[PDB]
Amino acid sequence: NRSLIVTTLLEEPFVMFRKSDRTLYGNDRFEGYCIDLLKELAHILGFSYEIRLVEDGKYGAQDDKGQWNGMVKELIDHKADLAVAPLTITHVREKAIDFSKPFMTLGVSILYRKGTPIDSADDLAKQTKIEYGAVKDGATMTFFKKSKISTFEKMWAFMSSKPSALVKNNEEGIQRTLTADYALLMESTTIEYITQRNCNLTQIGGLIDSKGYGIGTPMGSPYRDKITIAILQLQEEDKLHIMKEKWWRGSGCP
Numbered sequence: 001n002r003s004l005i006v007t008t009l010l011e012e013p014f015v016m017f018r019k020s021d022r023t024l025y026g027n028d029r030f031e032g033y034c035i036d037l038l039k040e041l042a043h044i045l046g047f048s049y050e051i052r053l054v055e056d057g058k059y060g061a062q063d064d065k066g067q068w069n070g071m072v073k074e075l076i077d078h079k080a081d082l083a084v085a086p087l088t089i090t091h092v093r094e095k096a097i098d099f100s101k102p103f104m105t106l107g108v109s110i111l112y113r114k115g116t117p118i119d120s121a122d123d124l125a126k127q128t129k130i131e132y133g134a135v136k137d138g139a140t141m142t143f144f145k146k147s148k149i150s151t152f153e154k155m156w157a158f159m160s161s162k163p164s165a166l167v168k169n170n171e172e173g174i175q176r177t178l179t180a181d182y183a184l185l186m187e188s189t190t191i192e193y194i195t196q197r198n199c200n201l202t203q204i205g206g207l208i209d210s211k212g213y214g215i216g217t218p219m220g221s222p223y224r225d226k227i228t229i230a231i232l233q234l235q236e237e238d239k240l241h242i243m244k245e246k247w248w249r250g251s252g253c254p
């Protein structure tokens with residue numbers, strides 16, 4: 001009956017500050033793929049919402065004591081009804097929150113500057129000159145932290161070693177990719193987006209694994225099943241494919 005609290009994060013092209021001469025406020029400040037997805041779910045399901053940015057600007061991971069941060073924490077403490085963001089569905093975070101069915105599929109990969117003909121994530125693990133990392137307290141960071149693959153255990157020992165190999169967000173990871181010999185372990189769909197706009201950047205190698213982005217809710221959320229059915233209906237008619245095309249289309253690279 002009331003307006004849901006939506007926690008989210010600035011992540012292009014998923015959630016961004018709309019451009020305007022006016023000073024914007026409320027939901028009107030935001031636009032992007034996830035905002036379109038939210039508009040569509042709110043229309044189908046008949047709910048309203050208030051979008052709030054998570055104060056610590058993080059997706060969510062556990063520390064050594066087991067406490068969460070990020071949007072995951074927001075759902076745990078019930079300070080948000082939904083998390084609408086490129087939020088990875090992981091069985092680790094299922095210990096604390098719940099997820100709708102995925103609205104987008106992706107995989108971890110490598111964002112690197114075209115110049116060295118490396119082709120594999122293994123090529124990074126067996127050296128030290130090219131520093132590499134991922135977004136701190138994210139699902140890509142946690143995937144290497146908890147992996148049992150001998151190659152990925154090798155890479156996590158690196159990132160655990162260097163202080164600033166773990167970056168605050170994708171923007172600063174991409175910037176570091178352009179200004180240093182650095183490789184960013186980043187998710188497939190973002191790499192597609194960045195490398196279409198930054199012709200100096202390329203995807204290195206295929207996908208490391210497979211995951212899906214879902215809308216997160218508190219455990220036992222009454223809106224969660226309604227969201228899942230709505231998302232599944234949208235994928236049947238390929239409306240989420242159209243929606244990705246709308247926000248990913250652009251210049252292209254020679």
Ligand SMILES: N[C@@H](Cn1c2c(c(=O)[nH]c1=O)CSC2)C(=O)O
Pocket residue numbers: 011059060086087088135137138139140141170185186187190
């Ligand atoms: N999906 C991750 C966050 N996250 C994201 C991107 C990425 O490249 N790495 C990463 O960890 C680009 S969309 C968000 C999470 O939910 O923790």
Ligand SMILES: [Cl-]
Pocket residue numbers: 025026027028049050
């Ligand atoms: Cl509003």
Ligand SMILES: [Cl-]
Pocket residue numbers: 051052053
């Ligand atoms: Cl806000």
Ligand SMILES: [Cl-]
Pocket residue numbers: 234235236237238239240241242
């Ligand atoms: Cl679809």
Ligand SMILES: [K+]
Pocket residue numbers: 019020021022023024
């Ligand atoms: K403005």
Ligand SMILES: [K+]
Pocket residue numbers: 001002003047048
């Ligand atoms: K309402």
